[PDB]
Ligand binder design. Structure first.
Ligand SMILES: CCCCCCCCCCC(CCCCCCCCCC)(CO[C@H]1O[C@@H](CO)[C@H](O[C@@H]2O[C@@H](CO)[C@H](O)[C@@H](O)[C@@H]2O)[C@@H](O)[C@@H]1O)CO[C@H]1O[C@@H](CO)[C@H](O[C@@H]2O[C@@H](CO)[C@H](O)[C@@H](O)[C@@H]2O)[C@@H](O)[C@H]1O
Lengths: 367, 24, 75
């Protein structure tokens, strides 16, 4: 099964937080610009068709077991000119309120704790050419999942990260049977100093620095029918920990872990690449991929199929995804569902993700 | 009382020209 | 009318005029940590080592198929 997974701090940053991208196999770096294009590619916020947008996304966890354990997302975007846009997103994972109770006269006042984990980011995107755009984002991450007891300190752990994204969208190009469109995107994510959960520099965790590279094509038929096919590749920019042994039995493992944990995040970004005696094929096992197809009718109905494949050596997240989207007047509703194909139980199995966006303001034409 | 590809390309060219002229 | 209390790594269920049939305690990972089909409104001693896990989910099945859900912190 999973041999040597990459250990990163705040892994909740890697979870898809909107139903549209979830229904497309957890990919958004090269899909069409939308209100959720902050976790995936902020650079396409400059390609938005509506001036302003707001969005609320709900991803429940352990639906059969309990309520209120969920990852929510609130996104807002405002493109001021036809070339630039500002965006701000907030992701919040929570277990809900938990009451701390001893029997102790059960009418007694009780303390409610809400262990949570949130990220708040703001991005600026600017169109360089008519077909290309770039974006820079700044994110603050806070983790408060611990509950204060005796001999347990529940101080929150915080960190900062930066995001560099690029998005290319071509104009409509006529072909023999259809007039499609081309899209490409890259996104370097979560570049920042290590997060210390125990507030000690010796015990710090890498931020989940990530690289997404994707490309997509739009088959446009009849001016009312669209088929967007997108492919995304993802690589974690965190060094892989040592495994069984990389030449005193436990001494070698201890020394290897000591040298691995004493690696800077900046240097770790480059150490993620290579670090193997083999070639590109041996390094291909650290690349996750996803393929998505989205059929769109009258820009008002959307039907999404997706496939996400991690290498079973790390993570073991392999699944198919179903998605649907509707647009009434200015309100868009997305629903997504997951069919797992992995041996390890997916925490988002048998779960319906919900998304709801409001679009308002001026309308921009698409080049 | 007063060759679909070529048509699609002509429509795209007309749309581009109209969108360029309208804003300026 | 239902209460779950944890004093020293011991779980204590309290139901007013309702008698329970089954109790199940799950982790945040969803793993079943404890299960008892012979609930007698009594206490429960789950294994104290849980590898840094504090939040637990208690599912109680009563006489009828009604299920009571409570999130607790294991202290
Ligand atoms: C403080 C925190 C935020 C509170 C701000 C409230 C502002 C409400 C904006 C409503 C919105 C998005 C709503 C969806 C998002 C909700 C998602 C909630 C999810 C919760 C989980 C569309 O909503 C439209 O619905 C229409 C009903 O069909 C109404 O049309 C109205 O009918 C007649 C009136 O009766 C009127 O004569 C008619 O002219 C209206 O067309 C209006 O209600 C509105 O235009 C925004 O769109 C538009 O609204 C207008 C103002 O109206 C906004 O103009 C600005 O507003 C203030 C700028 O801040 C400034 O002061 C103001 O100077 C400036 O002009 C713009 O933004 C604009 O783009």
């Amino acid at each position: 099964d999973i041999e040597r997974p990459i250990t990163t701090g705040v892994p909740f940053l890697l979870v898809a937080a909107d139903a549209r991208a979830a229904g497309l196999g957890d990919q958004g770096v090269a899909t069409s610009s939308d209100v959720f294009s902050q976790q995936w590619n902020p650079a396409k916020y400059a390609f938005a068709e509506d001036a302003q947008g707001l969005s609320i996304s709900y991803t429940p966890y352990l639906t059969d077991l309990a309520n209120d354990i969920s990852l929510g997302q609130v996104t807002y975007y405002n493109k001021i000119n036809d070339r630039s846009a500002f965006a701000g997103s907030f992701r919040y994972f929570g277990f809900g309120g938990i009451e701390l109770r001893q029997t102790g006269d059960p009418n007694e006042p009780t303390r409610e704790v809400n262990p949570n984990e949130f990220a708040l980011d703001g991005s600026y995107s600017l169109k360089l050419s008519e077909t290309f755009s770039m974006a820079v984002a700044a994110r603050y991450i806070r983790s408060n999942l611990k509950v204060a007891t005796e001999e347990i300190d529940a101080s929150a752990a915080g960190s900062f990260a930066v995001d560099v994204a690029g998005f290319y969208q071509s104009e409509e190009i006529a072909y023999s049977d259809f007039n499609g469109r081309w899209r490409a995107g890259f996104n370097i994510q979560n570049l920042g100093p290590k997060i210390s959960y125990d507030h000690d520099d010796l015990s710090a965790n890498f931020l989940p620095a990530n690289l997404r590279v994707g490309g997509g094509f739009d088959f446009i038929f009849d001016d009312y029918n669209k088929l967007g096919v997108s492919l995304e590749l993802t690589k974690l920019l965190v060094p892989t920990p040592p495994g069984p042994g990389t030449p005193s039995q436990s001494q070698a493992d201890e020394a290897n872990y000591k040298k691995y944990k004493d690696i800077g995040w900046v240097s770790g970004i480059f150490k993620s690449f290579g670090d193997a005696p083999g070639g590109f094929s041996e390094e291909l096992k650290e690349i996750t991929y996803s393929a998505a197809a989205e059929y769109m009718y009258q820009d008002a109905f959307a039907m999404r199929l997706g496939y996400y494949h991690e290498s079973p050596m790390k993570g073991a997240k392999q699944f198919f995804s179903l998605g649907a989207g509707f647009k009434y007047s200015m309100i868009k509703v997305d629903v997504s569902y997951l069919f797992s194909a992995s041996k390890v139980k997916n925490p988002l199995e048998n779960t319906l993700r919900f998304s709801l966006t409001f679009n308002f303001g001026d309308k921009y034409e698409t080049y | 009382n007063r060759p679909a590809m070529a048509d699609r390309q002509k429509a795209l060219d007309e749309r581009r020209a109209a969108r360029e002229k309208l804003i300026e | 009318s239902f209460y779950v209390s944890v004093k020293d790594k011991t779980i204590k269920l309290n139901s007013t005029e309702d008698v329970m049939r089954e109790v199940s305690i799950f982790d945040i990972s969803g793993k079943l940590l404890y299960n008892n089909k012979k609930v007698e409104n009594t206490e429960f001693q789950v294994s104290n080592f849980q590898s840094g896990n504090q939040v637990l989910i208690v599912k109680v099945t009563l006489d009828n198929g009604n299920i009571i859900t409570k999130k607790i912190v294991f202290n």
